[PDB]
Design a protein around this nucleic acid. Structure first.
Ligand SMILES: [Mg+2]
Ligand SMILES: [Mg+2]
Ligand SMILES: [Mg+2]
Ligand SMILES: [Mg+2]
Ligand SMILES: [Mg+2]
Ligand SMILES: [Mg+2]
Ligand SMILES: [Mg+2]
Ligand SMILES: [Mg+2]
Ligand SMILES: [Mg+2]
Ligand SMILES: [Mg+2]
Ligand SMILES: [Mg+2]
Ligand SMILES: [Mg+2]
Ligand SMILES: [Mg+2]
Ligand SMILES: [Mg+2]
Ligand SMILES: [Mg+2]
Ligand SMILES: [Mg+2]
Ligand SMILES: [Mg+2]
Lengths: 55, 68, 96, 100, 114
RNA sequence: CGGAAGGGCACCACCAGGAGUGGAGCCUGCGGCUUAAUUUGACUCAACACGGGAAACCUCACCCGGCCCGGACACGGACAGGAUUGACAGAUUGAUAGCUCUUUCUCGAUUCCGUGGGUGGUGGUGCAUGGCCGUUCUUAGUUGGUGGAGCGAUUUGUCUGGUUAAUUCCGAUAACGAACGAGACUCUGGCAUGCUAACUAGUUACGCGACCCCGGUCGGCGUAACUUCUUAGAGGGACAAGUGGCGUUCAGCCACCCGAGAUUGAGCAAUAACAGGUCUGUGAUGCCCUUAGAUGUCCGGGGCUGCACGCGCGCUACACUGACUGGCUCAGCGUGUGCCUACCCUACGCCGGCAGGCGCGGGUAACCCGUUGAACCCCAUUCGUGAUGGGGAUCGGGGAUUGCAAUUAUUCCCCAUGAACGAGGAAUUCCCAGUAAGUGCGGGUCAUAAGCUUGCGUUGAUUAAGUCCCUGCCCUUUGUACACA
């Protein structure tokens, strides 16, 4: 049926399973320290998180 | 844009006027006559009738098949 | 949206027992994360609250993946007329 | 008797003020106190591209996040530690009180 | 805590918490004069002060929108009942706040001033 | 702007050199060609190991098919004598897609049929835009208020001369008072036998234990003061301060004594602009296109890897200053069990040659991996100038891990096959002190995974303390028939 083909592909791995938590896109994801967000929004919200370019 | 192969039609639902009339058989006395088989499943206890096909019986929403 | 009537009444009862309701933008969700007792899929929650939004009953806000609906007074009156509830009881966001 | 306060903070001088205030509180409440033991700090380093797209010169950011962790051992019962940690806390410092 | 998360992930999660908080209240309290947030995380209580200009407009009809924001934070971040509480505070000398003058200027351009 | 002059500066310039690339193999990207599709953006610096783009599914935007509505809301029908959801069967299909045919059961006003209208779009347009980045432009430049000159566009201030990495200062002066930038600032590196600290770092003394002939070793155990080694806080320290010269004896320059430093390195970075890149980062977005037989969304397979060709970034090497085989012996950045999330670092004991497998433990981290027993290097054999024991491309047979799925070999291991390459033409890149180069280790991409990139550590030099010769840049003067210059 349609219920057995709509969301039956395995999403246990890969970059298509995870996404950004702002853009929900699947490119340039920062998975380090559980950020799980793209580098553009990381540059956007690094001041709000606490990251700062000291050196 | 124009296509070569014609499209596949949508399933036109076969409407049936008074399908409950084909279930029971009325009598002039005080009784009822049940033609089709009742399903013994837990979701459909005693009231739900089954489908009477040309070869063997089947109940739909609980998906239970009785072959001959 | 051919929704189940029990799930529709459960989502409207949750929306009445707390006026603002949240959701996550993900169609491929088995159950709602806040109300996990019933089935109540997230796509049904999104489309039911979008049907409330389109006819001017609820207020929309969004934070990156999450929908937020502020229930207005016309939505209070509509959910009261739908659920046939007495006008004495109020939601908890009006309670203090 | 031996109760361990762990102070984790991002800012430096605020954490120094908090640990010095805990030292002054232990000195006023007259208990055997150990010195503020510093841990080696952690520098969370992220290196991304400056350009949102990919077309430009190869420039790279260095986003740093320094976190610091001090610890103070106290020889006192639980109510004294709760009375000390309840008073004068500021948002930069996270406090973890271990009984054992 | 039973999940036992590391401090490396914990401070990052607090930073993303503050970032999503700031973005959500920037989107929601834009017409009312939003200027920032300040969250004090105490044991068993979470004080979270909205710093804004028009306190009467952020409180609304007998504190209704403040209670709505408490329920938003509770339902979204999974906080226990009565574990988080918001407080709206007025900005002194609000002309120096840059985002308040920015929202004032964009609402002037939306209203139709030159 | 000048193949015009007067000064200064830059290893994205030169000189003296160092390692190279271009010569061979392989990897990656682009163009071309082929193809159902080989998705696309970018083409000097400022495109081409770039989109963090190491794509078997997803990503995926391309092609071939098959599903679904996730077309809200309003207005009309239609219907409870049922508006209409789902369905194992036999056919069809790819699939156990009721997708359609044959066939009847089921859900119960949620829905379906039309008209307006939205919604969704990695669709088009960055020559409509926002934001961000790069570039002009790593150089030292730029701008008001008032006063003065000129009818005016404009000019002075913003400079004759000296000095500086600097429009940095001294000094002149129709200018005065100022402002951004530079500088100042922050972090990093080193010096403090002094202050604070320490059972998540130790020190040295003791008490034992083990071994060798009173003494020596122990990261074997435990405790006694202390912080030298450990880590991180407040301080301090270096300022052309002292001396000898040059210099209007001002601004400043060189050398030397004391000394851990007598230019450590990065971040930030002005006015004005490019019709530079991005709509394929966004639920940032205008307009246009589509919107049910979909450019929306889901699934299966393929492709993004295709190969007569050329270019670019890199890896492997061309060996004897080397290769192989054993022995010795030393690191620092770091990271590590996740909201969804299904995937962690691994000690130790057995099985197997190996890739690996089986069980008990430790670790949310100065606790455990871990004293991080890393390579280069050192020592001792084998080799003998032979395309050789250099080099490992290509290819056959087998064995393991990850995953639903490896075929166009995902990777790893074993045996075997053993190509060009004998130091590379014109051309050209990067660099001067713990620097280049050799060399290995962590993070990102990661389920499986480093020829890339970003950080760190080991060994560690040649040559230079200058110049405008080339390439360019910044001031002043000059000329212009240029001003998309
Ligand atoms: Mg057309
Ligand atoms: Mg030079
Ligand atoms: Mg060059
Ligand atoms: Mg040369
Ligand atoms: Mg070559
Ligand atoms: Mg791959
Ligand atoms: Mg694919
Ligand atoms: Mg889009
Ligand atoms: Mg442009
Ligand atoms: Mg253009
Ligand atoms: Mg596909
Ligand atoms: Mg490619
Ligand atoms: Mg070539
Ligand atoms: Mg060999
Ligand atoms: Mg050979
Ligand atoms: Mg790459
Ligand atoms: Mg002339």
């Amino acid at each position: 049926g349609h219920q057995q083909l709509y969301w039956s592909h395995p999403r246990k791995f890969g970059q298509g399973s995870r996404s950004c938590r702002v853009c929900s896109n699947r490119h340039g994801l920062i998975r380090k320290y559980g950020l799980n967000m793209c580098r553009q929004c990381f540059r956007q919200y690094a001041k709000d998180i606490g990251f700062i370019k000291l050196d | 844009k124009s296509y070569t192969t014609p499209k596949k039609n949508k399933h036109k639902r076969k409407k049936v006027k008074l399908a409950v009339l084909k279930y029971y058989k009325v009598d002039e006395n005080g009784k009822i006559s049940r033609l089709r088989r009742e399903c013994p499943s837990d979701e459909c206890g005693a009231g739900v009738f089954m489908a009477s096909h040309f070869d063997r019986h089947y109940c739909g929403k609980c998906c239970l098949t009785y072959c001959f | 949206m051919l929704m189940p009537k029990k799930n529709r009444i459960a989502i409207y009862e949750l929306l009445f027992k707390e006026g603002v309701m949240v959701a996550k933008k993900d169609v491929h969700m088995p159950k709602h994360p806040e109300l996990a007792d019933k089935n109540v899929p997230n796509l049904h929650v999104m489309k039911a609250m979008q049907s409330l939004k389109s006819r001017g009953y609820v207020k929309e806000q969004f934070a990156w993946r999450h929908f937020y609906w502020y229930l207005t007074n016309e939505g209070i009156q509509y959910l009261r007329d739908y659920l046939h509830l007495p006008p004495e009881i109020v939601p908890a966001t009006l309670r203090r | 008797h031996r109760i361990r306060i762990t102070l984790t903070s991002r800012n430096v001088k605020s954490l120094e003020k908090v640990c010095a205030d805990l030292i002054r509180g232990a000195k006023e409440k007259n208990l055997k106190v150990k010195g503020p033991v510093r841990m080696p700090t952690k520098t969370l380093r992220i290196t991304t591209r400056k350009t949102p797209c990919g077309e430009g010169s190869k420039t790279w950011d260095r986003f740093q996040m320094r976190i610091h962790k001090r610890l103070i051992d106290l020889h006192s019962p639980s109510e004294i530690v709760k009375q000390i940690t309840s008073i004068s806390i500021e948002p930069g410092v996270e406090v973890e009180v271990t009984i054992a | 805590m039973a999940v036992q998360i590391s401090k490396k992930r914990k401070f990052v999660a607090d930073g993303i918490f503050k970032a999503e908080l700031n973005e959500f209240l920037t989107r929601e309290l834009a017409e009312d004069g939003y200027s920032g947030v300040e969250v004090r995380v105490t044991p068993t209580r979470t004080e979270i002060i909205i710093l804004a200009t028009r306190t009467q407009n952020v409180l609304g009809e007998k504190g209704r929108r403040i209670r709505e924001l408490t329920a938003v934070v509770q339902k979204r971040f999974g906080f226990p009942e009565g574990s988080v509480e918001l407080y709206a505070e007025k900005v002194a000398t609000r002309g120096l706040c840059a985002i308040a003058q920015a929202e004032s200027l964009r609402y002037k351009l939306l209203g139709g001033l030159a």
